[PDB]
Amino acid sequence: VNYTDEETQKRKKEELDKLMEPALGYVTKIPVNIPSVRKTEISEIDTVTDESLSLVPNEDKLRTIANENYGSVVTKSGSNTMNFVRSGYTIDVVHYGLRDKGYVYYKGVHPSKELPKGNIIVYQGEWDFTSNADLDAKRPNYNPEFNGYGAGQEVGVTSADAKERTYISKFNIDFSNKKLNGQLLTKTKENQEKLRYTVEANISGNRFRGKATATDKTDPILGKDSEHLEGGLYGPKSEELAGKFVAHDKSLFAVFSGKRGNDVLETVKIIDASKIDLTTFESSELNNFGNANVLIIDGQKIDLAGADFKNRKTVDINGKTMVAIACCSNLEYMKFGQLWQKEGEQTKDNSLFLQGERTATDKIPVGGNYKYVGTWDALVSKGTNWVAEADNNRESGYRSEFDVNFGDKKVSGKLFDKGGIVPVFMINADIKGNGFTGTANTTDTGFALDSSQHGNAVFSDIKVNGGFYGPTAGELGGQFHHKSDNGSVGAVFGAKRQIEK
Known part of the structure; x- marks a missing residue:
């Protein structure tokens, strides 16, 4: 006798839900x-x-x-x-x-970090599938669509087993409304198209979640609906997409892919996710699906949320033991901090990281003056290593303060050492779209690495890249980095919009 685990409808539902993860x-x-x-x-x-x-x-x-x-x-x-x-x-x-x-x-x-600003954009591509194997699912011994005797009975039948048929996919993505509709068709040798599924999904980040509705419930192979369709936009500016759905009875697993035309489209950033390598002070991109509170290392996820102000998270990925210190708890739509690989008591591949979910461009305040308070993380190297580590002290901690003038589209900022009452870094940037770009500077003579004859660090007009995050740009974050022989620096910072009491 063949004994298998009894599964509740609950358990089944949960199992399907887990497949919706990006x-x-x-x-x-x-x-x-x-x-x-x-x-x-x-x-x-x-x-x-x-x-x-x-x-x-x-x-x-x-x-x-x-x-x-x-x-x-x-x-x-x-x-x-x-x-x-x-x-x-x-x-x-x-x-x-x-x-x-x-x-x-x-x-x-x-995974796309830029989307077309709006309008309906067409993506064309293909799809494939595998059925389950079932003897008692009224699958005909001869199939007019699929090659061979009793396709789908003992072995799952696939798009590969199809008699002179092509499996085309078409999508309309409403980028203005972040909605998505689509058709999955089968074309015959006589160039006759047959709709098999229609899909509908909503876009969050660079991912879409929705359903596939089977157009013919009498189909023994392709006749079951799916409430578990998930996919993503891929390419730097959402040039393509790919995804999947699973039938509610696990009787079909379908994958699909689309690609838009060559019409040049204006894009907008929706995601910031990058790291600064703290030994080369170069900035590389990170994979990210639109959730700033998750860090994607080598295709595996790391939750950054925690109960403390900032949190240490240790996760094993492909044998590599990763440690990440992620700040902060008051930031709903961004995270930043430290990231390294644990080599016993040593640490390799040290880096700083910043992640944030960009505010909708049309949701950036047109005017008004606001204060943003937060902190930062940094490494400066000039013979010795000066360091900033994120903390919860607004008075004497490693502060970061920002005055944002949305009217004049300008951002002024101060990055403090702890205890100091004068900033060691000073940021001036200009607001464009849902981001800002500027410069970070030290004072004329800079700041001391150690508190005579210990060196002084000095930095002139280092490029600062930043963004506004949250539904109404109530959070902001940024990074700057530079490597030379007179001194090097890597820094990421984050701040929350204020109200007065």
Whole structure:
């Protein structure tokens, strides 16, 4: 007898919900019935963490099984059309028996940090799917759509098993309203299109969450709705998208991909997420899906929220032990802080990081003068290392204070050492869109690294990049960095808008 875990509808729902988590990609295994069971649901749905488009998920393992047992692996990725996303399958087309038949997947690169400012933008692409395996699901021994005897009965049937059919996808993305509609079609050799699903989703960050509605509930393979469709926009300015949905009965796993035309569109930043390497003082980008309170390292997530003012989070990723100090608890829409790899008592790859969810451009205050109070993190290196570490002291801590004039579109700021009553860094920037750009300066003679003859640090007009974050730009953050021989600095800062008592 075949004993399996009883699952409540609750548990099932939760399991589906967990699949809605953003990721670079997803991949599932095509269900193959063991001889004793009549039905095998889709279940092995794994996230994808690798950032290489050329790497096809589990094509390695499938190749292997196609080697030991003889085998013929065919891989469809849509690599000849897409630049940032890959979707499709890798499948042993000569499959028999009980070994792996293959996998269906999507994956992407550079989760978009810029979106088209508005309007409806069309994305065209393709989609693929795998069914579950079921003997008692009225799947015909001859299928007019899918090759072979009893497709979908013992082994999941895929888009690869389709008789002279192409599986096209079309999307309308309303960037003004952050809504998304779409059609998944099947075109025949006679160039006749058949709608199979319609999709609807809402956009948060660079991800969209919604549903796929099966247009023909009488279809034994493609006839079940999905309330669990999730995907993302990929490419620096949302050039492409890819995503997936799962049928509510786990009887279908579909992936899809789209790409917009060449019409040059005005974009807007929605996400800031980068790090400054504290030994080269270069700034690199971080992957991020629009949630500033999560840090994406090597395709795996790290929650930064905590009960303290700032919080230390230690997470193991690919053997690498990562430690991140993330500030602050009063910042709902941004985080910044320290990030390194733990090497026993040593620490490598030291870096500062900043993340924030940019305010809607049309929601930036047109006028008014506001104070922003927060803190900062920094490393200055000139023979010795001066350091700023985020804290909760408004009076004598490592303060950061900001006067924002939304009328004159200017930002003035002071970055204090602790105890000091004069700032060691001074920021002047100009507001454009939902960001600001400027300069950080030391005083004419700068500030001392250690409190004679200990050195003085001096920095002239270092580029400052920053943004406003939150629904109404009530939070602000920024970074600056510079490496030379007369001295180097990496710094990130964050501040919360004030009201007077």
